[PDB]
Amino acid sequence: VRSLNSIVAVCQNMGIGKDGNLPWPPLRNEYKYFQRMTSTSHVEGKQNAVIMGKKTWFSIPEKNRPLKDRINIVLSRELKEAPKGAHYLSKSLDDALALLDSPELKSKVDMVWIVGGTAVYKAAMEKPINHRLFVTRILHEFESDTFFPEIDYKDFKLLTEYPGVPADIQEEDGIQYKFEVYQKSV
Numbered sequence: 001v002r003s004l005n006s007i008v009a010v011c012q013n014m015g016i017g018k019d020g021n022l023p024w025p026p027l028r029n030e031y032k033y034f035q036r037m038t039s040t041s042h043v044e045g046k047q048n049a050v051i052m053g054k055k056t057w058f059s060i061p062e063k064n065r066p067l068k069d070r071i072n073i074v075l076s077r078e079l080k081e082a083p084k085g086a087h088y089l090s091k092s093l094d095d096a097l098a099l100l101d102s103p104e105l106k107s108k109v110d111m112v113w114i115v116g117g118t119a120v121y122k123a124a125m126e127k128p129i130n131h132r133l134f135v136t137r138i139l140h141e142f143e144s145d146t147f148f149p150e151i152d153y154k155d156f157k158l159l160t161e162y163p164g165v166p167a168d169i170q171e172e173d174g175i176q177y178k179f180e181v182y183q184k185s186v
């Protein structure tokens with residue numbers, strides 16, 4: 001594919017999950033940002049694709065699956081068929097990537113977003129392809145059991161601004177966070 005996008009929200013310890021869910025209670029505005037970013041295509045007639053791991057898939061309440069308006073791909077080495085509601089099952093990112101470029105999809109897909117978890121982010125970060133990482137930094141610590149992998153600051157440069165991403169510190173429910181965009185160029 002031409003370029004990847006990854007989106008994640010992380011707390012001060014780099015935690016992204018806890019017991020199958022997020023480490024913090026619901027943040028409405030942060031979640032709508034994720035929805036807007038992943039859902040918005042810049043081409044009429046195309047939709048974005050979201051790739052995620054098996055635990056992330058199952059972390060979404062059943063009635064809310066598949067994430068509306070996007071093509072859902074789940075990654076799994078153990079499953080045989082796409083879980084009920086997902087559009088495609090792939091055995092590795094490479095395969096999800098090759099699927100995307102296939103004839104039937106290529107013409108249907110605008111952006112590719114990586115939505116986690118850990119091993120998915122890591123794999124995508126390592127591909128020698130152009131990539132933008134949209135990070136929400138939550139300026140607090142929450143107990144976590146799942147963490148975001150280390151980003152190579154020599155490769156991923158923090159942008160000082162980017163179209164449609166607020167620059168100031170945000171606050172909601174007594175919590176502060178900031179949006180950051182890192183860009184890797186090959």
Ligand SMILES: NC(=O)c1ccc[n+]([C@@H]2O[C@H](COP(=O)([O-])OP(=O)(O)OC[C@H]3O[C@@H](n4cnc5c(N)ncnc54)[C@H](OP(=O)(O)O)[C@@H]3O)[C@@H](O)[C@H]2O)c1
Pocket residue numbers: 007008009010015016017018019020021022052053054055056057059075076077078079090091092093115116117118119120123146
């Ligand atoms: N804060 C956030 O932005 C954010 C984003 C996503 C998730 N989360 C949280 O993180 C947790 C889910 O994360 P996780 O890291 O534990 O799980 P995951 O990445 O969602 O799921 C792991 C399963 O995914 C499959 N898989 C993962 N990477 C693979 C690859 N490269 N190729 C093939 N299959 C691969 C494997 O399934 P098989 O074992 O079947 O092979 C692996 O066991 C939940 O707590 C969720 O709430 C938070």
Ligand SMILES: C[C@H](O)[C@H](O)C1=Nc2c(nc(N)[nH]c2=O)NC1
Pocket residue numbers: 007008009022030031033034056059060115116136
């Ligand atoms: C897709 C499922 O919601 C998953 O937990 C994700 N959550 C978030 C995300 N990205 C942000 N910014 N916020 C979330 O809450 N990426 C993935």
Ligand SMILES: [Ca+2]
Pocket residue numbers: 078
């Ligand atoms: Ca497993």
